[PDB]
Structure 1
Amino acid sequence: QSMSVKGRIYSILKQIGSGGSSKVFQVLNEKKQIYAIKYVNLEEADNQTLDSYRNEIAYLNKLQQHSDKIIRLYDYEITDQYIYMVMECGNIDLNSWLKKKKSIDPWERKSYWKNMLEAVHTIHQHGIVHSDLKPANFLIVDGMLKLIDFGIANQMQPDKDSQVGTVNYMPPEAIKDMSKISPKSDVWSLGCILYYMTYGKTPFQQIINQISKLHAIIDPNHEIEFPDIPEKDLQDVLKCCLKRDPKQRISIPELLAHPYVQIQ
């Protein structure tokens, strides 16, 4: 099968992912260049869902010129029935990659981390707080990590359980506030991803019961374990990201001036 976007024809190689009323396909243009096209079916979409997709497209377009750590959006077609977004095609998402890998290279972990900070910092500059960061929001595109979405609309999974979620990256202030959400909330989630890339587990994964897990995340008495590692700077980053008090938690601008990101 093939699809048309702004008078340009793309042939479908395969479906990469799905989630709700959206599908992502690996496609080729006439010159045999690879792209990823995101198709959103708007036929059963409520005003709230519509506005979320409009807001996600607007921010992707706006952020193109600000950072190359944001996934490229080349073109799009939006009607009342559907949305087509032509984007750069990545090799794999970070969650699928972390599930495969037995061990991560220290240099690779540092380079990916730098990319994540730059991408998240860019959205923060524009007043966006993602609030739902997790490895699946990151795409590996020829050695560099790029942010795929802004947490504004529907997330997707590779191609399966539509019920699947994770509270493993959720910050304490988001749970306590039941507005406490700030850029600091994304620092905690990034901290959890880096903790996963360092210890091979998220800080609270060992807790089965979801209620108990949420209780441990907000409990000041539940001490997060930071076992000794050769990179002392990395250990400091982790501890600074995973402070329960968001006022005491490190900021992204400070994380970008950290020895861990700036020094070999």
Structure 2
Amino acid sequence: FQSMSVKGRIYSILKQIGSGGSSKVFQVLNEKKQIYAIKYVNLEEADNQTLDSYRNEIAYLNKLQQHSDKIIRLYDYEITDQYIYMVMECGNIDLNSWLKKKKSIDPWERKSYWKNMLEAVHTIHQHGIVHSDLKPANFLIVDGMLKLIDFGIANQVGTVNYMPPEAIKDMISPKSDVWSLGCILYYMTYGKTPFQQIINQISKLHAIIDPNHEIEFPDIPEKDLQDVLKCCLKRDPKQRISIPELLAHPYVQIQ
């Protein structure tokens, strides 16, 4: 059994949840036997722009948690020249792992999750943040609630199935996140992303930008859900619905 120290407080490591870019996420217990998630970041090989991207995301995370409970909690952190330790909220599972494990999703569960994703993404937009790389792995289930875990600021790896056509053309506005959220809801509706069937990545990238390539929206009992999907997956950002409009949509309002 291994331990860690964060700002004088001792944490015993239970297990490693994940491992990213020079990073590890651990499930830990504090002195009062409370469960937390500790994100460890190794700063050994990080350059000044990478460091500035890390500091900037921490500051936004720290500031934005007061504005919405749909943003993961950041309780404390320890930052040196060698590492970052972030004491965070521990969730049950990320949305990507949950969706991959589940056969059929409940329409009520789908709707509450969609409301949470809208509230979290709306919060970051109000602060001038466009995520631009939204995917289900950016969301965490904490007591039947979805929380955004990151803001896309700091430097499902390289997935293209949630990419807006304008991100492919450029290589970004708040509308880019609407397309990505639309793809997540489409996955929660039909069990696949709109272009998932296209295995070849270049042929898939061409389909996402092609106006002639029609996205299929098969008939479902929830007509409002079908409408949200069609409104989100408009290839022209100017013709795409906004987050404030999605928040007043019958799909999230009509009980």
Q: What range is the shorter-chain TM-score in?
A: over 0.9
Distance 2:45 2:140 in 1: 28
Post-superposition shift, 1:20? 1.6
Post-superposition shift, 1:165? 2.4
| 1:50-78 alpha-carbon deviations (Å, 9 max, x no partner) | 11110110000010110000000000000
| 1:186-232 alpha-carbon deviations (Å, 9 max, x no partner) | 00000000000000000001111100100000000000000000000
TM-score, scaled to structure 1: 0.95
Distance 1:165 1:50 in 2: 21
Name structure 1 gaps, 5 residues minimum.
155-162
Distance 1:170 1:29 in 2: 39
Alignment size in residue pairs? 254
Partner residue in 2 for 1:195:
186
| 1:92-151 alpha-carbon deviations (Å, 9 max, x no partner) | 000000000000000000000000000000000000000000000000001000000001
Question: Equivalent residue of 2:240, what SS?
Answer: coil
Post-superposition shift, 1:177? 1.8
Distance 2:168 2:3 in 1: 45
Distance 1:228 1:144 in 2: 28
Q: What does 1:1-264 align with in structure 2 at a 5 Å threshold? A: 1-154=2-155, 164-178=157-171, 181-264=172-255
Question: Equivalent residue of 1:15, what SS?
Answer: strand
Distance 2:238 2:25 in 1: 39
Post-superposition shift, 1:176? 1.4
Q: Which moved more, 1:217-226 or 1:39-48?
A: 39-48
Distance 1:222 1:44 in 2: 43
Question: Equivalent residue of 1:89, what SS?
Answer: coil
- Runs of 4 or more consecutive aligned structure 1 residues displaced over 4 Å after TM superposition: none
Change (3 A) 1:85 1:164: closer
Distance 2:191 2:7 in 1: 44
Distance 2:31 2:60 in 1: 28
Question: Equivalent residue of 2:227, what SS?
Answer: helix
Question: Equivalent residue of 2:40, what SS?
Answer: strand
Post-superposition shift, 1:164? 4.4
TM-score, scaled to structure 2: 0.98
Post-superposition shift, 1:263? 1.3
Post-superposition shift, 1:166? 1.0
Post-superposition shift, 1:152? 1.1
Distance 1:129 1:90 in 2: 24
Distance 1:165 1:91 in 2: 24
Distance 2:139 2:209 in 1: 26
Change (3 A) 1:169 1:66: same
Distance 1:50 1:164 in 2: 20
What's the Cα RMSD here? 0.9
Distance 2:84 2:175 in 1: 32
Distance 1:64 1:95 in 2: 22
Question: Equivalent residue of 1:117, what SS?
Answer: helix
Distance 2:248 2:211 in 1: 28
Distance 1:60 1:232 in 2: 36
Distance 1:15 1:165 in 2: 22
Q: Which moved more, 1:53-62 or 1:163-172?
A: 163-172
Task: Give the % identical residues.
Answer: 100
